[PDB]
């Protein structure tokens, strides 16, 4: 027993991290097969970032303008192209450490692991959620761009995220591995609105099942409710509305604990309108929404 | 910017995880060079755990009673011995993926990463602290024993922890890699007292420097204090007493933020005797004591 925010083991992804330099900008890339994937803003200076024309900026760049380095060894670039906001650099060497992988666009509320890198070197690993407003609340310093987000499913790495931007609010936006941004964000240094960020109600519920599983039960109460009356309360607290899909997804946890979803929904309702009153739940004094039901099942 | 509880990248340690079986007990071991390190209670049944005589139980065991498996490949055991609560199994094959490493006994309050394993397979990775009472508040299911705790220092893995026991309070005890328990714990299924666990004041302070660095400043107040008057307040809140070593360790953060340690100590004092009043700090509604000053410097 016990409960922690646990990332997937990072070794498969470590073996794919490279350094990409173009002009004087250096950031991270991801070497799979004979292609290196990186943020297209690698071609931009500080000044360029204010209002880049990527198409024009790219046109001044040849293969030899891109330095790809893999630990100590330089890779030869034999081709370059831009896919949305990602640059793909064809190199002559297949990565000998390429895992089985795929590229997936995750949905708001799903979670993943981030291997934070600097100059192509793994610095550290943590679990994130794609927020409903398509930001992440990560840890990202200068040179972290091109660090990737992923899930591992047996032997198979599903890459879901590439870090590109810190916004003026100190929050993080990025793309899938085809280079389409999550959310309305662009790869420009201008002020950009994240919407109001809501709580991932389904994830909060999963964590309460986790708490109960762990013996943390005090918040369980004498009520039940309805999907509509719950949602009527959810909406007031900027909680994502709960649907029958969410209910069905929780069912395995329902079954394990003998606690019906709507009963758990009623306990949550009371927490929402009474607070936690000083007590903690799985050692937190807030409601946690960064664990999926899959994430709770795995650890429990 | 941004702040997360980040583990070290797990790949070096992944390549050292093996499965050890003896009788019908299976747990994890750590394969470095031609030695496999595992919990000695691998030799025990459920029944044995109530009152094991390890010396006598071990005497019924030969090399061939130990099955060591490394992914798909069986290792041949050519030697066995017991070092404190660790069993060392000499095998005929040096691990080809042995990183540079050392064995270190960490001090209460230092932090490390855990690669949680099942049957020799990495399941996940998270950051832990050795609590002042020498427990850890990890995430550990049946078969997690022999999972290891570590720090990485450039290319070098410092192994500091091997998981052995879940206590009846649902907390975790284990050894260094020479097999000496942290704390008063033994490898026996009997009720065992952890002491009262205190907060790692120096780590809380580091996190407040992290908060300030991140722009989270609201808790900064108009007071200062003295080491003694702070400690007089620390003691009431089961905070570890702050020393001049702790002060010196914080100095780099002092310098970065322009906030003197004693000033930060005064803000903490007020938080302690006023609570957080509903506000959050680096997105938490409690005071966090699981980041060292080194851990804050690294990420900041």
Coordinates of C-alpha atoms in Angstrom, one line a residue:
Chain A
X1 CA 0.0 0.0 0.0
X2 CA 0.8 3.7 -0.1
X3 CA 0.2 6.2 -2.9
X4 CA 2.6 8.4 -5.0
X5 CA 2.6 10.4 -8.2
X6 CA 4.7 7.9 -10.2
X7 CA 6.2 8.4 -13.7
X8 CA 6.8 5.6 -16.1
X9 CA 10.5 4.4 -16.2
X10 CA 12.4 6.7 -18.5
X11 CA 15.1 4.4 -20.0
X12 CA 13.5 3.8 -23.4
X13 CA 13.0 7.5 -24.0
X14 CA 16.5 8.5 -22.5
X15 CA 18.1 6.5 -25.4
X16 CA 16.3 8.8 -27.9
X17 CA 17.2 12.2 -26.6
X18 CA 19.6 14.3 -28.8
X19 CA 20.9 17.8 -29.0
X20 CA 19.8 19.9 -32.0
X21 CA 21.6 23.2 -32.8
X22 CA 20.7 25.7 -35.6
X23 CA 22.4 29.1 -35.6
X24 CA 23.0 29.7 -31.9
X25 CA 19.7 28.2 -30.6
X26 CA 20.2 24.8 -28.9
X27 CA 17.3 22.5 -27.8
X28 CA 16.3 18.9 -27.5
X29 CA 15.2 16.5 -30.2
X30 CA 13.8 12.9 -30.3
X31 CA 15.7 10.4 -32.5
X32 CA 13.5 7.6 -33.7
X33 CA 14.7 5.5 -36.7
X34 CA 16.5 7.9 -39.2
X35 CA 14.4 11.0 -38.2
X36 CA 15.0 13.6 -35.5
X37 CA 11.9 15.4 -34.3
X38 CA 12.3 18.9 -32.7
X39 CA 10.5 22.2 -32.2
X40 CA 10.6 24.3 -35.4
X41 CA 11.5 27.4 -33.3
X42 CA 15.0 26.0 -33.2
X43 CA 15.5 28.2 -36.3
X44 CA 14.5 31.3 -34.4
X45 CA 16.6 33.9 -32.4
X46 CA 15.0 35.7 -29.5
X47 CA 14.0 38.5 -31.9
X48 CA 12.5 36.0 -34.4
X49 CA 10.2 34.7 -31.7
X50 CA 8.3 38.0 -31.5
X51 CA 6.8 37.5 -35.0
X52 CA 8.4 34.5 -36.9
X53 CA 7.6 33.7 -40.5
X54 CA 8.7 30.1 -40.2
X55 CA 8.3 29.4 -43.9
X56 CA 10.7 32.3 -44.8
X57 CA 13.1 31.6 -41.9
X58 CA 13.3 28.0 -42.8
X59 CA 14.1 28.9 -46.5
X60 CA 17.5 30.4 -45.3
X61 CA 18.3 27.0 -43.7
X62 CA 20.0 24.0 -45.4
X63 CA 20.7 20.5 -44.0
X64 CA 24.2 21.5 -42.9
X65 CA 22.8 24.4 -40.8
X66 CA 21.4 21.7 -38.5
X67 CA 23.8 20.1 -36.0
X68 CA 22.4 17.0 -34.4
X69 CA 24.5 15.5 -31.6
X70 CA 23.9 12.2 -29.9
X71 CA 26.0 12.0 -26.8
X72 CA 29.4 12.6 -28.3
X73 CA 28.7 11.6 -31.9
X74 CA 27.5 14.0 -34.6
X75 CA 24.7 12.8 -37.0
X76 CA 24.6 13.8 -40.7
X77 CA 21.4 15.4 -41.8
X78 CA 20.3 14.4 -45.3
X79 CA 16.9 16.1 -45.4
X80 CA 14.7 18.6 -43.5
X81 CA 11.0 19.5 -43.5
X82 CA 8.4 21.2 -41.4
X83 CA 5.3 19.4 -40.2
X84 CA 3.0 21.9 -38.5
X85 CA 5.2 23.2 -35.6
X86 CA 7.7 20.3 -35.6
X87 CA 10.8 20.1 -37.7
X88 CA 11.7 16.6 -38.9
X89 CA 15.5 16.1 -39.6
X90 CA 16.3 13.0 -41.7
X91 CA 19.7 11.6 -40.6
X92 CA 21.7 8.8 -42.2
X93 CA 21.8 6.6 -39.1
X94 CA 18.8 4.8 -37.7
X95 CA 18.8 5.1 -33.9
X96 CA 20.0 1.7 -32.6
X97 CA 18.0 2.3 -29.4
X98 CA 14.7 3.1 -31.0
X99 CA 12.0 1.4 -28.8
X100 CA 8.7 0.2 -30.2
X101 CA 6.7 3.4 -30.3
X102 CA 3.7 5.3 -31.6
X103 CA 2.5 8.9 -31.8
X104 CA -0.8 9.6 -30.0
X105 CA -2.8 12.8 -29.4
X106 CA -4.1 12.5 -25.9
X107 CA -7.3 14.0 -24.7
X108 CA -7.7 16.7 -21.9
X109 CA -7.5 15.0 -18.5
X110 CA -5.2 12.1 -19.6
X111 CA -1.8 11.9 -17.9
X112 CA 1.8 11.3 -19.0
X113 CA 5.4 11.3 -18.0
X114 CA 7.8 14.1 -19.0
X115 CA 11.6 13.5 -19.3
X116 CA 12.9 17.1 -18.7
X117 CA 16.1 17.5 -20.8
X118 CA 18.9 20.1 -21.2
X119 CA 21.2 20.1 -24.3
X120 CA 20.0 16.5 -25.1
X121 CA 20.8 15.2 -21.6
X122 CA 18.0 13.7 -19.3
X123 CA 17.7 15.8 -16.2
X124 CA 14.6 14.3 -14.5
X125 CA 11.2 12.6 -14.8
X126 CA 7.7 13.5 -13.5
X127 CA 4.0 12.8 -14.2
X128 CA 1.8 15.5 -15.8
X129 CA -1.8 15.9 -16.9
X130 CA -3.0 17.6 -20.0
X131 CA -5.3 20.2 -18.3
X132 CA -8.8 20.8 -19.7
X133 CA -7.5 24.1 -21.0
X134 CA -4.6 22.2 -22.8
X135 CA -1.8 23.7 -20.6
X136 CA 0.4 21.6 -18.4
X137 CA 1.8 22.8 -15.0
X138 CA 5.3 21.3 -15.5
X139 CA 8.8 22.2 -14.6
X140 CA 10.6 23.7 -17.6
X141 CA 13.8 25.9 -17.6
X142 CA 15.6 27.5 -20.6
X143 CA 16.7 24.8 -23.0
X144 CA 13.9 22.3 -21.9
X145 CA 12.2 22.8 -25.3
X146 CA 11.8 19.5 -27.3
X147 CA 11.6 17.5 -24.0
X148 CA 8.8 14.9 -24.6
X149 CA 5.8 13.5 -22.8
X150 CA 4.9 9.8 -23.0
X151 CA 3.1 6.7 -21.8
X152 CA 4.6 3.1 -21.8
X153 CA 2.2 0.2 -22.6
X154 CA 4.2 -3.0 -22.0
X155 CA 7.2 -2.6 -24.4
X156 CA 5.6 0.2 -26.4
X157 CA 6.3 4.0 -25.9
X158 CA 3.4 6.2 -26.9
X159 CA 4.8 9.7 -27.4
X160 CA 2.0 12.3 -26.8
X161 CA 3.8 15.7 -26.1
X162 CA 6.7 17.9 -27.2
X163 CA 7.4 21.0 -25.0
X164 CA 7.7 24.3 -27.0
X165 CA 6.6 27.3 -25.0
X166 CA 6.4 29.0 -21.6
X167 CA 3.6 31.5 -21.6
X168 CA 3.8 34.8 -19.6
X169 CA 1.6 33.2 -16.9
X170 CA 4.5 30.7 -16.3
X171 CA 2.5 27.8 -17.8
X172 CA 3.5 25.4 -20.5
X173 CA 2.2 24.7 -24.0
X174 CA 3.4 22.3 -26.6
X175 CA 2.4 19.9 -29.4
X176 CA 1.8 16.3 -30.3
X177 CA 4.6 14.6 -32.3
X178 CA 2.9 15.6 -35.6
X179 CA 3.5 19.2 -34.3
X180 CA -0.1 20.3 -33.8
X181 CA -0.5 22.4 -30.6
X182 CA -2.6 21.3 -27.7
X183 CA -5.1 24.2 -27.2
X184 CA -5.2 27.6 -29.0
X185 CA -1.4 28.2 -28.5
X186 CA 1.0 29.4 -31.2
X187 CA 4.9 29.3 -31.3
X188 CA 5.2 33.0 -30.9
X189 CA 6.4 35.2 -28.0
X190 CA 3.2 37.1 -27.6
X191 CA 0.7 37.2 -24.6
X192 CA -1.6 34.1 -25.0
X193 CA -4.7 33.3 -23.0
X194 CA -5.2 30.0 -21.4
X195 CA -8.9 29.7 -20.6
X196 CA -10.2 29.2 -17.1
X197 CA -8.8 25.8 -16.0
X198 CA -11.3 23.3 -14.6
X199 CA -10.8 20.3 -12.3
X200 CA -10.8 16.8 -13.9
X201 CA -13.8 15.5 -11.8
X202 CA -13.3 11.9 -13.1
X203 CA -9.6 11.9 -11.9
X204 CA -10.6 13.4 -8.5
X205 CA -13.1 10.5 -8.1
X206 CA -10.4 7.9 -9.0
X207 CA -8.1 9.4 -6.3
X208 CA -10.9 9.1 -3.7
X209 CA -11.3 5.4 -4.6
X210 CA -7.5 5.2 -4.2
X211 CA -7.8 6.9 -0.7
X212 CA -10.5 4.4 0.4
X213 CA -8.4 1.5 -1.0
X214 CA -5.5 2.8 1.1
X215 CA -7.7 3.0 4.3
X216 CA -8.3 6.8 4.1
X217 CA -12.1 6.8 4.6
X218 CA -13.0 9.8 6.9
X219 CA -14.6 11.8 4.0
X220 CA -17.1 9.0 3.3
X221 CA -20.5 10.4 4.2
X222 CA -24.2 9.3 4.6
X223 CA -25.6 10.8 1.3
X224 CA -26.0 9.9 -2.3
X225 CA -27.0 12.1 -5.3
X226 CA -27.9 12.3 -9.0
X227 CA -25.7 12.9 -12.0
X228 CA -27.5 16.2 -12.6
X229 CA -27.4 17.5 -9.0
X230 CA -23.8 16.6 -8.8
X231 CA -23.0 18.4 -12.1
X232 CA -25.1 21.4 -10.8
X233 CA -22.6 21.5 -7.9
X234 CA -19.6 20.6 -10.2
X235 CA -20.3 23.6 -12.5
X236 CA -20.3 26.0 -9.5
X237 CA -16.8 24.8 -8.5
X238 CA -15.4 24.7 -12.1
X239 CA -15.4 21.0 -12.2
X240 CA -15.6 19.3 -15.5
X241 CA -19.2 17.8 -15.9
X242 CA -19.4 14.1 -15.1
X243 CA -20.9 11.8 -17.8
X244 CA -21.9 8.1 -18.0
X245 CA -18.6 7.4 -19.7
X246 CA -16.8 8.7 -16.6
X247 CA -19.1 6.5 -14.5
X248 CA -18.4 3.4 -16.6
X249 CA -14.7 4.1 -16.5
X250 CA -14.8 4.2 -12.6
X251 CA -16.8 0.9 -12.4
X252 CA -13.8 -1.4 -11.7
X253 CA -13.0 0.8 -8.7
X254 CA -16.7 0.9 -7.8
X255 CA -16.6 -2.9 -7.7
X256 CA -13.3 -3.2 -5.7
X257 CA -14.4 -0.8 -3.0
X258 CA -18.2 -1.6 -2.8
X259 CA -18.8 2.1 -3.2
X260 CA -21.2 3.3 -5.9
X261 CA -20.0 6.1 -8.1
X262 CA -23.0 8.3 -7.1
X263 CA -22.2 7.7 -3.4
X264 CA -18.6 8.8 -4.0
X265 CA -20.0 11.8 -6.0
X266 CA -22.0 12.8 -2.9
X267 CA -18.9 12.7 -0.6
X268 CA -17.1 14.8 -3.2
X269 CA -20.0 17.3 -3.2
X270 CA -19.7 17.7 0.6
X271 CA -16.0 18.2 0.4
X272 CA -16.5 20.8 -2.3
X273 CA -19.0 22.8 -0.2
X274 CA -17.4 22.2 3.2
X275 CA -13.6 22.1 2.3
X276 CA -11.3 19.5 4.0
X277 CA -11.5 21.2 7.4
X278 CA -7.7 20.8 8.1
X279 CA -7.7 17.0 7.4
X280 CA -5.6 15.5 4.6
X281 CA -6.4 12.8 2.0
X282 CA -3.6 10.5 0.8
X283 CA -1.4 13.1 2.5
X284 CA -2.8 16.2 0.6
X285 CA -4.8 19.2 1.9
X286 CA -6.3 19.7 -1.6
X287 CA -8.3 17.5 -4.0
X288 CA -6.0 15.9 -6.6
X289 CA -7.1 15.7 -10.2
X290 CA -3.8 14.4 -11.9
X291 CA -4.5 10.7 -11.6
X292 CA -6.6 8.9 -14.1
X293 CA -8.7 5.8 -13.2
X294 CA -6.1 3.8 -15.1
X295 CA -3.4 5.4 -13.1
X296 CA -5.1 4.4 -9.8
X297 CA -5.8 0.8 -11.0
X298 CA -2.1 0.4 -12.0
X299 CA -0.8 1.5 -8.6
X300 CA -3.6 -0.2 -6.6
Chain B
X1 CA 9.9 28.1 -14.4
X2 CA 7.3 25.8 -12.7
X3 CA 8.0 23.3 -9.8
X4 CA 7.5 19.5 -9.7
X5 CA 8.6 16.5 -7.6
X6 CA 11.0 15.1 -10.1
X7 CA 12.8 11.8 -10.0
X8 CA 16.2 11.1 -11.5
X9 CA 16.0 9.3 -14.9
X10 CA 15.7 5.6 -14.2
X11 CA 17.5 3.9 -17.2
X12 CA 20.8 3.1 -15.6
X13 CA 19.0 1.4 -12.7
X14 CA 16.4 -0.3 -15.0
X15 CA 19.3 -2.2 -16.7
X16 CA 20.2 -3.7 -13.2
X17 CA 16.8 -5.1 -12.1
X18 CA 16.5 -8.9 -11.9
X19 CA 14.0 -11.5 -10.6
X20 CA 15.2 -13.6 -7.7
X21 CA 13.2 -16.7 -6.7
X22 CA 13.9 -19.1 -3.7
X23 CA 11.4 -21.7 -2.8
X24 CA 8.1 -20.0 -3.8
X25 CA 9.0 -16.5 -2.7
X26 CA 9.8 -14.1 -5.7
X27 CA 11.2 -10.6 -5.3
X28 CA 13.5 -8.1 -7.0
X29 CA 17.3 -8.0 -6.9
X30 CA 20.0 -5.6 -8.2
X31 CA 22.6 -7.0 -10.5
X32 CA 25.9 -5.1 -10.4
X33 CA 29.0 -6.8 -11.8
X34 CA 28.9 -10.6 -10.9
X35 CA 26.8 -10.1 -7.7
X36 CA 23.0 -9.9 -7.2
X37 CA 21.8 -8.1 -4.1
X38 CA 18.4 -8.9 -2.7
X39 CA 16.5 -8.9 0.6
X40 CA 17.4 -12.0 2.7
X41 CA 13.7 -12.6 3.5
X42 CA 13.6 -14.1 -0.1
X43 CA 14.3 -17.4 1.8
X44 CA 11.2 -17.0 4.1
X45 CA 7.6 -18.2 3.6
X46 CA 4.7 -16.2 5.1
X47 CA 5.1 -18.4 8.2
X48 CA 8.9 -17.9 8.5
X49 CA 8.3 -14.1 8.6
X50 CA 6.6 -14.4 12.0
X51 CA 9.9 -15.4 13.7
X52 CA 12.7 -16.2 11.2
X53 CA 16.1 -17.6 12.2
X54 CA 17.8 -16.4 9.1
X55 CA 21.0 -18.2 9.8
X56 CA 19.3 -21.6 10.2
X57 CA 16.9 -20.9 7.3
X58 CA 19.8 -20.0 5.1
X59 CA 21.7 -23.2 6.0
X60 CA 19.0 -25.3 4.2
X61 CA 19.7 -23.3 1.0
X62 CA 22.3 -24.0 -1.7
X63 CA 23.4 -22.0 -4.7
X64 CA 20.9 -24.0 -6.9
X65 CA 18.0 -23.1 -4.7
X66 CA 18.3 -19.5 -6.0
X67 CA 16.8 -18.7 -9.4
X68 CA 18.1 -15.5 -10.8
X69 CA 16.4 -14.3 -14.0
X70 CA 17.4 -11.3 -16.1
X71 CA 14.6 -10.6 -18.5
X72 CA 14.4 -14.0 -20.3
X73 CA 17.9 -15.3 -19.4
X74 CA 18.7 -17.4 -16.2
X75 CA 21.9 -16.6 -14.3
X76 CA 24.0 -19.3 -12.7
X77 CA 24.7 -18.7 -9.0
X78 CA 28.2 -19.8 -7.9
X79 CA 28.2 -18.5 -4.3
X80 CA 25.8 -17.1 -1.7
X81 CA 26.3 -15.2 1.5
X82 CA 24.3 -13.0 4.0
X83 CA 25.5 -9.5 4.8
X84 CA 23.3 -8.1 7.6
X85 CA 19.7 -8.2 6.0
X86 CA 20.9 -8.5 2.4
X87 CA 21.7 -11.6 0.5
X88 CA 24.5 -11.4 -2.0
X89 CA 24.3 -14.0 -4.9
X90 CA 27.6 -14.4 -6.9
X91 CA 26.7 -15.2 -10.5
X92 CA 29.0 -16.2 -13.3
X93 CA 28.1 -13.3 -15.6
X94 CA 29.1 -9.6 -15.0
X95 CA 26.2 -7.4 -15.8
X96 CA 27.0 -5.8 -19.2
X97 CA 24.8 -2.8 -18.2
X98 CA 26.4 -2.1 -14.8
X99 CA 26.6 1.7 -14.5
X100 CA 29.3 3.5 -12.5
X101 CA 28.0 3.3 -9.0
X102 CA 28.5 3.4 -5.3
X103 CA 26.7 2.4 -2.1
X104 CA 25.9 5.3 0.3
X105 CA 24.0 5.5 3.6
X106 CA 21.9 8.6 3.4
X107 CA 21.0 10.7 6.4
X108 CA 17.4 11.5 7.6
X109 CA 16.0 14.3 5.5
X110 CA 18.0 13.5 2.2
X111 CA 15.9 12.5 -0.8
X112 CA 16.2 9.8 -3.5
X113 CA 14.4 8.2 -6.4
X114 CA 12.7 4.8 -6.2
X115 CA 12.2 2.5 -9.2
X116 CA 9.2 0.4 -8.0
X117 CA 9.5 -3.1 -9.5
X118 CA 7.5 -6.3 -9.8
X119 CA 9.1 -9.7 -10.7
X120 CA 12.3 -7.8 -11.8
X121 CA 10.3 -5.5 -14.2
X122 CA 10.3 -1.7 -13.7
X123 CA 6.8 -0.5 -13.0
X124 CA 7.4 3.2 -12.2
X125 CA 9.6 5.9 -10.6
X126 CA 9.1 8.6 -7.9
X127 CA 11.0 10.8 -5.4
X128 CA 11.1 9.9 -1.7
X129 CA 12.6 11.3 1.4
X130 CA 14.2 9.4 4.3
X131 CA 11.9 10.7 7.0
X132 CA 13.6 11.7 10.4
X133 CA 12.1 8.6 11.9
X134 CA 13.7 6.5 9.1
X135 CA 10.5 5.4 7.4
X136 CA 9.5 6.4 3.8
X137 CA 6.0 7.1 2.7
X138 CA 6.3 5.3 -0.6
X139 CA 4.0 3.2 -2.9
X140 CA 4.8 -0.5 -2.5
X141 CA 2.6 -3.5 -3.4
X142 CA 3.2 -7.2 -2.9
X143 CA 6.4 -8.2 -4.8
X144 CA 7.9 -4.7 -4.6
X145 CA 10.6 -5.9 -2.1
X146 CA 14.2 -5.4 -3.4
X147 CA 13.2 -2.3 -5.4
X148 CA 16.0 0.2 -4.9
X149 CA 16.4 3.9 -4.0
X150 CA 19.1 6.0 -5.6
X151 CA 20.7 9.4 -6.6
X152 CA 22.5 10.0 -9.9
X153 CA 25.6 12.4 -9.8
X154 CA 26.6 12.9 -13.5
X155 CA 27.3 9.3 -14.7
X156 CA 27.4 7.8 -11.3
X157 CA 24.5 6.0 -9.5
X158 CA 24.6 6.2 -5.7
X159 CA 22.4 3.4 -4.4
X160 CA 21.1 4.3 -0.9
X161 CA 18.0 2.1 -0.3
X162 CA 16.5 -1.4 -0.7
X163 CA 12.8 -1.9 0.2
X164 CA 12.1 -4.8 2.6
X165 CA 9.0 -4.3 4.7
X166 CA 5.6 -2.7 5.0
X167 CA 4.8 -2.2 8.6
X168 CA 1.2 -2.5 10.1
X169 CA 0.9 1.3 9.9
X170 CA 1.2 1.0 6.0
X171 CA 4.7 2.6 6.1
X172 CA 7.9 1.4 4.5
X173 CA 11.2 0.3 6.0
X174 CA 14.3 -1.0 4.3
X175 CA 18.1 -1.1 4.3
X176 CA 21.2 0.4 2.7
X177 CA 23.0 -1.8 0.1
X178 CA 25.2 -3.3 2.9
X179 CA 21.9 -4.5 4.4
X180 CA 21.7 -2.4 7.6
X181 CA 18.2 -1.1 8.3
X182 CA 17.4 2.5 8.4
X183 CA 15.9 3.1 11.8
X184 CA 15.1 0.5 14.5
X185 CA 13.2 -1.8 12.1
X186 CA 13.8 -5.6 11.7
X187 CA 12.9 -8.0 8.9
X188 CA 10.1 -9.7 10.9
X189 CA 6.3 -9.6 10.6
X190 CA 5.7 -8.2 14.1
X191 CA 4.3 -4.8 15.1
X192 CA 7.0 -2.2 15.0
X193 CA 7.0 1.4 16.2
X194 CA 8.1 4.2 14.1
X195 CA 8.7 7.1 16.3
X196 CA 6.8 10.4 16.0
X197 CA 7.8 11.8 12.6
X198 CA 8.9 15.4 12.5
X199 CA 9.1 17.9 9.6
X200 CA 12.4 18.5 7.8
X201 CA 12.5 22.2 8.5
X202 CA 15.6 22.8 6.3
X203 CA 13.7 21.2 3.3
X204 CA 10.5 23.3 4.0
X205 CA 12.7 26.4 3.9
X206 CA 14.3 25.4 0.6
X207 CA 10.8 25.0 -0.9
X208 CA 9.8 28.5 0.2
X209 CA 12.9 29.8 -1.6
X210 CA 11.7 27.8 -4.6
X211 CA 8.2 29.4 -4.2
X212 CA 9.7 32.9 -4.1
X213 CA 12.0 32.0 -7.1
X214 CA 8.8 31.0 -8.9
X215 CA 7.0 34.3 -8.1
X216 CA 4.9 32.8 -5.2
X217 CA 5.5 35.5 -2.6
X218 CA 2.3 36.2 -0.6
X219 CA 3.5 34.4 2.5
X220 CA 6.5 36.8 2.8
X221 CA 5.9 38.9 5.9
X222 CA 7.3 42.0 7.8
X223 CA 9.1 40.1 10.7
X224 CA 12.5 38.4 11.4
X225 CA 13.5 36.1 14.3
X226 CA 16.4 34.3 16.0
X227 CA 17.5 30.7 15.6
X228 CA 16.4 30.0 19.3
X229 CA 13.0 31.7 19.0
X230 CA 12.4 29.9 15.7
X231 CA 13.4 26.6 17.2
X232 CA 11.2 27.3 20.2
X233 CA 8.3 27.5 17.7
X234 CA 9.7 24.5 15.6
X235 CA 9.7 22.2 18.6
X236 CA 6.0 23.0 19.3
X237 CA 5.1 22.0 15.7
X238 CA 7.4 18.8 15.6
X239 CA 9.8 20.6 13.3
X240 CA 13.4 19.3 13.3
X241 CA 15.5 22.0 15.0
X242 CA 17.3 24.4 12.6
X243 CA 21.1 24.6 13.0
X244 CA 23.9 26.8 11.5
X245 CA 24.7 23.9 9.1
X246 CA 21.1 24.2 7.7
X247 CA 21.6 28.0 7.5
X248 CA 24.8 27.6 5.6
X249 CA 23.3 25.0 3.3
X250 CA 20.5 27.5 2.4
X251 CA 23.0 30.4 1.7
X252 CA 23.0 30.0 -2.2
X253 CA 19.2 30.3 -2.1
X254 CA 19.6 33.2 0.4
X255 CA 21.9 34.9 -2.1
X256 CA 19.7 34.3 -5.2
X257 CA 16.5 35.6 -3.6
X258 CA 17.9 38.4 -1.5
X259 CA 16.0 37.0 1.5
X260 CA 17.9 36.2 4.6
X261 CA 17.4 32.8 6.2
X262 CA 16.1 34.2 9.5
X263 CA 13.6 36.3 7.5
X264 CA 12.4 33.2 5.7
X265 CA 12.4 31.5 9.2
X266 CA 10.0 34.3 10.4
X267 CA 7.6 33.8 7.5
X268 CA 7.5 30.1 8.2
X269 CA 6.8 30.7 11.9
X270 CA 3.7 32.8 11.0
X271 CA 2.6 30.1 8.5
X272 CA 3.0 27.5 11.4
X273 CA 0.9 29.5 13.9
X274 CA -1.6 30.9 11.3
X275 CA -1.9 28.1 8.8
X276 CA -2.2 28.8 5.1
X277 CA -5.7 30.3 5.3
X278 CA -6.9 28.6 2.1
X279 CA -4.1 29.9 -0.2
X280 CA -1.6 27.5 -1.8
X281 CA 2.2 27.5 -2.2
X282 CA 3.6 26.0 -5.4
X283 CA 0.1 24.6 -5.8
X284 CA 0.0 22.8 -2.4
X285 CA -2.2 23.5 0.6
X286 CA 0.4 22.1 3.0
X287 CA 4.1 22.8 3.8
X288 CA 6.3 20.4 1.8
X289 CA 9.4 18.9 3.4
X290 CA 10.5 16.4 0.7
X291 CA 12.8 18.7 -1.3
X292 CA 16.4 19.3 -0.2
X293 CA 18.2 22.6 -0.9
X294 CA 20.2 20.7 -3.5
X295 CA 16.9 19.5 -5.0
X296 CA 15.7 23.1 -5.2
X297 CA 19.0 24.4 -6.7
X298 CA 18.9 21.7 -9.4
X299 CA 15.4 22.5 -10.6
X300 CA 15.8 26.3 -10.1

